[PDB]
Amino acid sequence: SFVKDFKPQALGDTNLFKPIKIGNNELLHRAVIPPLTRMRALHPGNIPNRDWAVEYYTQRAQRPGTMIITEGAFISPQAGGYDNAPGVWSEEQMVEWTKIFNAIHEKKSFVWVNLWVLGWAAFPDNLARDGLRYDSASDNVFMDAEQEAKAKKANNPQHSLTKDEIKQYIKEYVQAAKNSIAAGADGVEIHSANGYLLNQFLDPHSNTRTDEYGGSIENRARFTLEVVDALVEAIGHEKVGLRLSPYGVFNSMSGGAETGIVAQYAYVAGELEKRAKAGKRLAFVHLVEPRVTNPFLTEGEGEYEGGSNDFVYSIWKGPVIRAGNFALHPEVVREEVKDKRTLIGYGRFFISNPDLVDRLEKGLPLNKYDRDTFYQMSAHGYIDYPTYEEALKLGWDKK
Ligand SMILES: Cc1cc2nc3c(=O)[nH]c(=O)nc-3n(C[C@H](O)[C@H](O)[C@H](O)COP(=O)(O)O)c2cc1C
Ligand SMILES: [Mg+2]
């Protein structure tokens, strides 16, 4: 079952296949695997699937020199909220993560742990059960209707983080980052996009605070930057990444509707480039394409014609990973990669194609992804996707 009506194009002759260096890693191509939640972690314990996780990542580390940003990992119990998402706070979890990283490194690929904190995107009932607060930037604005419904049902109102709680969250980022490197992770990517906690602070719609963590560009960017400054000093700026989704409106973020959103983000990028001067330039900056403001929806629905991230290029001088609907558009990838410091993140199709990189370099048919197994406790739709050879022998081309 390959994708029809799609005319592939060999990209082997573009820079997509030219070696670049990110942090301490020396990639052999520039097609990256962005953080993809698959929800196969175990419960209780948010334990990395002791059965399929290793095989899954291994299958996608097959192409040597692949930079793999793992699926979102909770830094601690409070930062979580989804029973089947993995974490990087306990020993039990670190024992399973170490096995995955060795599988990845063994295939001569790299791995970067994405540090995840759901904020208001977390299920409140799940938090009330473990005795956890329902965190967020404020208490008078909720994600949406179904959420303020669960918040009340479990009498777990949306709590507005105080100063000491952010510091506690910042203590956990350093520990999650440390444990990650301790086990052989090539680095860590601070997840500050798609409407999760940090993003909830960056966004003016979700951030109605008055203190130094709200009330202005400077203040709404305070949290994310303290985390940046925290992990940089603890593990080394060459082991830290940052993800942002300027025009994303996922998890009820402002997006391009807010006029000063571009200022909110140009500020952040400038501060990175600032530290980039003190000799402390984060390994990279990962951006979710405006083309994709909602990670969870059809392939084409939800974009912005009056907004682009090309502005970050005018401020940030380090590498840039751009992610969002690129597999079925090699014409756009061919052009976007003429920039010597731009990598490309493929999500949906790395899920369906374990040997994606080879299929880009040669212009071969892409495996269709099954939307129903994105988040499912199963191997089917997780690790049984065929490689180009396996798909052929199976007559996937419908002869
Ligand atoms: C099943 C699935 C899970 C995802 N999980 C996450 C996540 O945990 N964090 C995140 O920031 N983005 C997440 N994304 C968005 C991806 O990082 C990526 O930006 C998105 O797939 C857009 O690229 P694509 O259109 O080429 O797939 C997810 C996407 C999918 C399809
Ligand atoms: Mg045959």
Swiss-Prot record:
EC class (word): oxidoreductase
Domain of life: Eukaryota
Chain segments annotated as coiled-coil in the UniProt record: none
UniProt-annotated binding residues for substrate: H191, N194, Y375
Assembly and binders: Homodimer or heterodimer.
PANTHER family: NADH OXIDOREDUCTASE-RELATED, NADPH DEHYDROGENASE 2-RELATED
This protein's name: NADPH dehydrogenase 1
Organism: Saccharomyces pastorianus (Lager yeast)
Gene: OYE1
